[PDB]
Design an enzyme around this catalytic site. Structure first.
Site, PDB file in Angstrom:
ATOM      1  N   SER A 145     -36.757  42.918-129.214  1.00 20.94           N
ATOM      2  CA  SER A 145     -36.425  44.325-128.980  1.00 20.94           C
ATOM      3  C   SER A 145     -37.179  45.350-129.852  1.00 20.94           C
ATOM      4  O   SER A 145     -37.139  46.564-129.590  1.00 20.94           O
ATOM      5  CB  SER A 145     -34.914  44.542-129.118  1.00 20.94           C
ATOM      6  OG  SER A 145     -34.484  44.411-130.461  1.00 20.94           O
ATOM      7  N   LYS A 199     -32.656  48.330-134.843  1.00 18.75           N
ATOM      8  CA  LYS A 199     -33.246  49.304-133.920  1.00 18.75           C
ATOM      9  C   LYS A 199     -33.774  50.478-134.739  1.00 18.75           C
ATOM     10  O   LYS A 199     -33.593  50.532-135.963  1.00 18.75           O
ATOM     11  CB  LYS A 199     -32.179  49.840-132.947  1.00 18.75           C
ATOM     12  CG  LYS A 199     -31.551  48.808-132.012  1.00 18.75           C
ATOM     13  CD  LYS A 199     -32.477  48.467-130.862  1.00 18.75           C
ATOM     14  CE  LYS A 199     -31.950  47.295-130.047  1.00 18.75           C
ATOM     15  NZ  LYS A 199     -31.918  46.047-130.853  1.00 18.75           N
TER      16      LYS A 199
END
Lengths: 223, 6
Positions: A11, A53
């Protein structure tokens, strides 16, 4: 105080690859995140999991994501939703072939920009600047977000979010392969564990198996 | 430590 973490998924490609080992600097005085910081936090939906993230939206920011161009738009101080301050300079470089290819059947491969893989698609690399902090992101050219699955903020048009106080908006650098704020909402200040500052080890590996080799070349800082 | 970060 630091804490090492292992990167199992893609990710955050290309910034962080599968098989990487990172060093996280605890937020805790307890400093706050800076726009563009790579942050590790407790996944809201399931706090038993640590997610990694990029903090794209700070409290008060009005975040907008164009599913077509796949570009972010930020407008700080949009607290009271007033005709808030100028748009934060979000700059993008020309799309270009990245060094990886996604395959399906599920899988990423670092491949010479001239080759192609069966049942695979060359991902597009490009730079994004969130104010003054620049980093890369990958995009799968044959994909586009399904606004329908997006988390919709009460009273906000689809694909637009006004970040609440003490909350943050997170997005993964591997933009079309990241279950981030676009789908499950904001992250509370309390869930924040820290800022990722470096890679101390790195094994070339496909998620779910052991290493194919090393990548000592990646040891260093990240941003 | 160690562990993962999705």
């Amino acid at each position: 105080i630091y804490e090492p973490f292992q990167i199992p998924s893609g990710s955050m490609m290309p910034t962080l690859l599968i098989g990487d080992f990172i060093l996280v600097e605890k937020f805790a005085e307890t400093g706050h995140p800076k726009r563009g910081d790579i942050v590790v936090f407790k996944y809201p939906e399931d706090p038993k999991l640590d997610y990694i993230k990029r903090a794209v939206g700070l409290p008060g920011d009005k975040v907008t994501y164009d599913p077509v161009s796949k570009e972010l738009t930020i407008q700080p101080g949009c607290s009271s939703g007033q005709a808030c301050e100028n748009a934060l300079p979000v700059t993008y470089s020309n799309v270009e072939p990245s060094d990886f290819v996604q395959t399906f059947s599920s899988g990423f491969f670092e491949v010479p920009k001239n080759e192609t893989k069966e049942n695979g698609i060359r991902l597009s690399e490009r730079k994004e600047t969130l104010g003054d902090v620049t980093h890369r992101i990958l995009t799968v050219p044959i994909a586009q977000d399904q606004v329908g699955m997006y988390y919709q903020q009460p009273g906000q048009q689809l694909a637009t979010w006004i970040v609440p106080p003490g909350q943050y908006f997170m997005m993964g650098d591997n933009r079309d392969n990241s279950a981030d704020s676009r789908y499950w909402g904001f992250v509370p200040e309390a869930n924040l564990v820290g800022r990722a500052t470096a890679i101390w080890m790195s094994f070339d590996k496909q998620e779910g198996e052991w290493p194919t080799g090393l990548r000592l070349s990646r040891i260093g800082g990240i941003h | 430590x160690x562990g993962g970060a999705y």
